Amino acid sequence: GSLPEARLRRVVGQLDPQRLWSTYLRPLLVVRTPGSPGNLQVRKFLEATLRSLTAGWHVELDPFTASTPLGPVDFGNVVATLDPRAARHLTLACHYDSKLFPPGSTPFVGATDSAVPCALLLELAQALDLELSRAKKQAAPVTLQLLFLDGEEALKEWGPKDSLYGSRHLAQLMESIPHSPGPTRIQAIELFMLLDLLGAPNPTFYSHFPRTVRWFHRLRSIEKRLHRLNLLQSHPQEVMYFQPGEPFGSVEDDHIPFLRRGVPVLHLISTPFPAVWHTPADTEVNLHPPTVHNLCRILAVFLAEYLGL
Ligand SMILES: c1ccc(Cn2ccnc2)cc1
Ligand SMILES: [Zn+2]
């Protein structure tokens, strides 16, 4: 169920690293705390970019107001579903908000956390647009969904109530909406793959959920293959990212509200975290571009194999 070497090198060749970097990543690297103008502008940028894709995605916002330590705040999740008619979908997710820090420092823009995840999803959707479009026209049975969640980060301290505002809301919302066969939109998620903390040098990923280990093994195999095919940079050893064995640690994140409702999850998060995590140095200059593009190639092959593109 793997690509022939020919399909694979063509798929990798559809990626455009400058597009990823300049068209998708750079515009996100602004302060975008919930309720801010910057957050609103990034939301509108994601929406408009997704609506421009030629495949003709269904794009909708999930807006809500919630109580926070800062008083009422308005949040909005961006939900892009390629074929709303389809029974089920692979869902790829990330958070688009940036963590609020108090005034008086260099602004926190969360390059790894999660501007790079956001940009990867946009690049994958654009690079595979012709294949995705063809699949949707063929009424392919499993479509693609991209979620850009708001309010992942705590506004003032992490706990079950000041965190995950967007994902908690969206999971409850999906539970309340009928789908066919469903019976609700929660059952339409065939797999929930959450990208977080990506773009630093030397990431390490582990399988967080035995239920989904087969897909983790697929990612590891694709890393090894692309290494052997001379398609990964600054990758001097065949397995570097996808590590076998017990996880370093689990991480509370936007998958939790879905996991608790029985959705299968793969958590694609570096553990240990980037050295710059939750400091103002989590910026563009501290990203490692070759790693970002390595991950984009791994993910593009994964996506084409998962969906038969
Ligand atoms: C502790 C608690 C929660 C997290 C979740 N997280 C992920 C990205 N930024 C924050 C990480 C560590
Ligand atoms: Zn964070």
CA of 152 to the centre of ligand 1 (A): 8
CA 111 to CA 114: how far, in whole Å?
A: 6
Radius of gyration of the chain (CA): 18
CA 270 to CA 272: how far, in whole Å?
A: 6
- CA 36, 281, 193, 167 torsion: positive or negative? negative
Pocket test for ligand 1, best of 156, 248, 252 (most atoms within 8 A of CB): 252
3-class secondary structure for 40-107?
HHHHHHHHHHHHHCCCCCEEEEEEEEEEECCEEEEEEEEEEECCCCCCEEEEEEEECCCCCCCCCCCC
Amino acid at position 198, single letter: L
Exposed/middle/buried for residue 181 (C-beta within 10 Å: 0-12, 13-18, 19+): exposed
CA 273 to CA 171: how far, in whole Å?
A: 26
Amino acid at position 77, single letter: N
Dihedral, 165, 60, 307, 270 alpha carbons, nearest 10? -30
Residue in 196, 223, 253, 254 annotated catalytic: 196
Q: Which two tokens stand for residue 201?
A: 């040098």
Report the nearest atom of ligand 1 relative to the CA of 278. Answer: 9
CA 280 to CA 151: how far, in whole Å?
A: 18
CA 105 to CA 116: how far, in whole Å?
A: 22
Q: In what order do the strands lie in the sheet with 189-196?
A: 58-68, 71-81, 142-149, 88-95, 189-196, 265-269
User: Quick check: is 152 catalytic?
Assistant: yes
Report the nearest atom of ligand 1 relative to the CA of 253. Answer: 5
- CA 131, 137, 139, 144 torsion: positive or negative? positive
Instruction: For ligand 1, atom 10, name the residue with the nearest CA.
Output: 153
CA 16 to CA 18: how far, in whole Å?
A: 6
CA of 302 to the centre of ligand 2 (A): 25
Domain boundaries, the chain: 1-309
**In this structure, which long-range contacts are made by residues 168-176, counting pairs with CB atoms below 8 Å and at least 24 apart in sequence?**
168/257, 169/62, 169/64, 169/66, 169/75, 169/77, 170/62, 170/77, 170/79, 170/257, 171/257, 171/258, 171/260, 171/261, 172/257, 173/62, 175/261
Exposed/middle/buried for residue 157 (C-beta within 10 Å: 0-12, 13-18, 19+): exposed
With a CB cutoff of 8 Å and minimum separation 6, the contacts of 256 are: 164, 167
CA of 219 to the centre of ligand 1 (A): 23
Pocket test for ligand 1, best of 251, 268, 271, 277 (most atoms within 8 A of CB): 251
Distances (CA, A) of 288 to 40, 109, 122, 267, 271: 28, 16, 19, 21, 17
PDB resolution in Å? 1.1
**Experimental method reported for this structure:** X-ray
Domain at 1-309, CATH class: alpha beta
CA 106 to CA 93: how far, in whole Å?
A: 28
Angle at 256 (CA atoms; ends 203, 122), nearest 5 degrees: 55
3-class secondary structure for the chain?
CCCCHHHHHHHHHHCCHHHHHHHHHHHHCCCCCCCCHHHHHHHHHHHHHHHHCCCCCEEEEEEEEEEECCEEEEEEEEEEECCCCCCEEEEEEEECCCCCCCCCCCCCCCHHHHHHHHHHHHHHHHHCHHHHHHHHHCCCCEEEEEEEECCCCCCCCCCCCCCCHHHHHHHHHHHHCECCCCCEHHHHEEEEEEEECCCCCCCCECCCCHHHHHHHHHHHHHHHHHHHCCCCCCCCCCCCCECCCCCCCCCCCCCHHHHCCCCCEEEEECCCCCCCCCCCCCCHHHCCHHHHHHHHHHHHHHHHHHHCC
CA 212 to CA 11: how far, in whole Å?
A: 24
Pocket test for ligand 1, best of 158, 271, 278 (most atoms within 8 A of CB): 158
- CB-based pocket (< 6 A), ligand 1: 113, 153, 158, 196-197, 251-253
Q: Cβ distance 59 to 78 under 8 Å? A: yes
- For 56, half-sphere exposure in the C-beta direction (CA atoms, 13 angstrom radius) is 8
Instruction: For ligand 1, atom 2, name the residue with the nearest CA.
Output: 252
CA 159 to CA 141: how far, in whole Å?
A: 38
Summarize the annotated binding site for Zn(2+) as residue ranges. 113, 153, 278
Report the nearest atom of ligand 1 relative to the CA of 114. Answer: 8
Q: Cβ distance 268 to 194 under 8 Å? A: yes
Query: Which residue is it, tokens 């293959």?
Result: 225
Q: Cβ distance 86 to 76 under 8 Å? A: no
Residue in 152, 223, 254, 305 annotated catalytic: 152
User: Quick check: is 196 catalytic?
Assistant: yes
In terms of Cα–Cα distance, which of 207, 204, 198 is closest to 240? Answer: 204
Q: Which two tokens stand for residue 185?
A: 């939109």
Q: Cβ distance 144 to 82 under 8 Å? A: yes
Amino acid at position 213, single letter: V
